[PDB]
């Protein structure tokens, strides 16, 4: 598409912000608020529509995990509710295959889900599929060659270096090689033939390291680290480069946005969000 959209997030409380960054000119645009504040959500795009999935509203008047799916139309600048999921999922991971949205893991109160469900926009309906082999919240999810990957997270007791792959035509999950680092709340995306895992929380410290999984070799290799340690960052890919947005570094909620160029193996700061925040949902689509 053309713009990087960041939805929701957390600073002092869950946020309703929707804002769009244009890499071509540096500009930020503030768009229509979410109907309900939420942090720990995921964003994705299908057919030119932005989707905000899951999360939690951490507010003065109580804390509510979200099962919500909401749809944003850039042409109209209006959010609309979509069918809710079977279960609330805070710290969710999402991926898109063949126009279907997969919602992975996340938490509801003290329940850490291994369950997974799939949304079909043409029917506005969610169906459960096979659950993951491991409960995961703060899981990173990405898609490559019509396969879905769940990376890292927290199972309710331990933070994880493990990862697994979902094979849709077999409705089956299989473990892949574990990462070299334990990561909860990492940004996970795909570029070329690799699954990238950036930042996160390893139990003791927020991370700046970044590693990538080559699906052909089945090995993880570290690349250059980000300039800022961060967990609960937003990530996306835009014209062959990785963007990381916000996060928590153990001291500050970051407004920093960094961009990774895989050809030079370098990160640079490219812009700042209008305010620091973690737990945002991010996606890329057309300009409104
Ligand atoms: O990294 C984190 O777990 C968070 O930033 C977060 C916040 C909102 C949603 C997900 C995650 C923590 C909030 C309390 C301190 C940091």
From Swiss-Prot:
Kelch repeat positions: 3-48, 49-99, 100-146, 147-193, 195-240, 241-287
Compartments reported by the entry: Cytoplasm; Nucleus
Effect of residue 56 to M: Impaired interaction with NFE2L2/NRF2
The record's account of how the chain is modified after translation: Non-enzymatic covalent modifications of reactive cysteines by electrophile metabolites inactivate the BCR(KEAP1) complex. Accumulation of fumarate promotes the formation of cysteine S-succination (S-(2-succinyl)cysteine), leading to inactivate the BCR(KEAP1) complex and promote NFE2L2/NRF2 nuclear accumulation and activation. Nitric oxide-dependent 8-Nitro-cGMP formation promotes cysteine guanylation (S-cGMP-cysteine), leading to NFE2L2/NRF2 nuclear accumulation and activation. Degraded via a proteasomal-independent process during selective autophagy: interaction with phosphorylated SQSTM1/p62 sequesters KEAP1 in inclusion bodies, leading to its degradation.
Site (Sensor for electrophilic agents): 110
Listed result of changing residue 206 to A: Impaired interaction with SQSTM1/p62
Disruption phenotype: Early postnatal lethality caused by abnormal cornification. Mice survive until weaning and probably die from malnutrition resulting from hyperkeratosis in the esophagus and forestomach that cause gastric obstruction. Defects are caused by constitutive activation Nfe2l2/Nrf2, leading to constitutive expression of phase 2 detoxifying enzymes. Mice lacking both Nfe2l2/Nrf2 and Keap1 reverse the hyperkeratosis phenotype and are healthy and viable in normal conditions.
Residues modified to S-cGMP-cysteine: 110
Its biological purpose: Substrate-specific adapter of a BCR (BTB-CUL3-RBX1) E3 ubiquitin ligase complex that regulates the response to oxidative stress by targeting NFE2L2/NRF2 for ubiquitination. KEAP1 acts as a key sensor of oxidative and electrophilic stress: in normal conditions, the BCR(KEAP1) complex mediates ubiquitination and degradation of NFE2L2/NRF2, a transcription factor regulating expression of many cytoprotective genes.
Family from the record: Belongs to the KEAP1 family.
Record note on domains: The Kelch repeats mediate interaction with NFE2L2/NRF2, BPTF and PGAM5. KEAP1 contains reactive cysteine residues that act as sensors for endogenously produced and exogenously encountered small molecules, which react with sulfhydryl groups and modify the cysteine sensors, leading to impair ability of the BCR(KEAP1) complex to ubiquitinate target proteins.
Subunit structure: Component of the BCR(KEAP1) E3 ubiquitin ligase complex, at least composed of 2 molecules of CUL3, 2 molecules of KEAP1, and RBX1. Interacts with NFE2L2/NRF2; the interaction is direct. Forms a ternary complex with NFE2L2/NRF2 and PGAM5. Interacts with (phosphorylated) SQSTM1/p62; the interaction is direct and inactivates the BCR(KEAP1) complex by sequestering it in inclusion bodies, promoting its degradation. Interacts with NFE2L1. Interacts with BPTF and PTMA. Interacts with MAP1LC3B. Interacts indirectly with ENC1. Interacts with SESN1 and SESN2. Interacts with HSP90AA1 and HSP90AB1.
Protein name (database record): Kelch-like ECH-associated protein 1
Organism: Mus musculus (Mouse)
Organism classification: Eukaryota, Metazoa, Chordata, Craniata, Vertebrata
């Amino acid at each position: 598409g053309r713009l990087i959209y960041t939805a929701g997030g957390y600073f002092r409380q869950s946020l309703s912000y929707l804002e769009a960054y244009n890499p071509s000119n540096g500009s930020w645009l503030r768009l229509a608020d979410l109907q309900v504040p939420r942090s720990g959500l995921a964003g994705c795009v299908v057919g030119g529509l932005l989707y905000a999935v899951g999360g939690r509203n951490n507010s003065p008047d109580g804390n509510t995990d979200s099962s919500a799916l909401d749809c944003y139309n850039p042409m109209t600048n209006q959010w609309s509710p979509c069918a809710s999921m079977s279960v609330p999922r805070n710290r969710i991971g999402v991926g898109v295959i063949d126009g279907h949205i997969y919602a992975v893991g996340g938490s509801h109160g003290c329940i850490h889900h291994s369950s997974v469900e799939r949304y079909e926009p043409e029917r506005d309906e969610w169906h459960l599929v096979a659950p993951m082999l491991t409960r995961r919240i703060g899981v990173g999810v990405a898609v490559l060659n019509r396969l879905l990957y769940a990376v890292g997270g927290f199972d309710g007791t331990n933070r994880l270096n493990s990862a697994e792959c979902y094979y849709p035509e077999r409705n089956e999950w299989r473990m892949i090689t574990p990462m070299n680092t334990i990561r909860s709340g990492a940004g996970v995306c795909v570029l070329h033939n690799c699954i990238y895992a950036a930042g996160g929380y390893d139990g003791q410290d927020q991370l700046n390291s970044v590693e990538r999984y080559d699906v052909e070799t089945e090995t993880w290799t570290f690349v250059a680290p980000m300039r800022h340690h961060r967990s609960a960052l937003g990530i996306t890919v835009h014209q062959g480069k990785i963007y990381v947005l916000g996060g928590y570094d153990g001291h500050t909620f970051l407004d920093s946005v960094e961009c990774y160029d895989p050809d030079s193996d370098t990160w640079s700061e490219v812009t700042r969000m209008t305010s620091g925040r973690s737990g945002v949902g991010v996606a890329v689509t057309m300009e409104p």
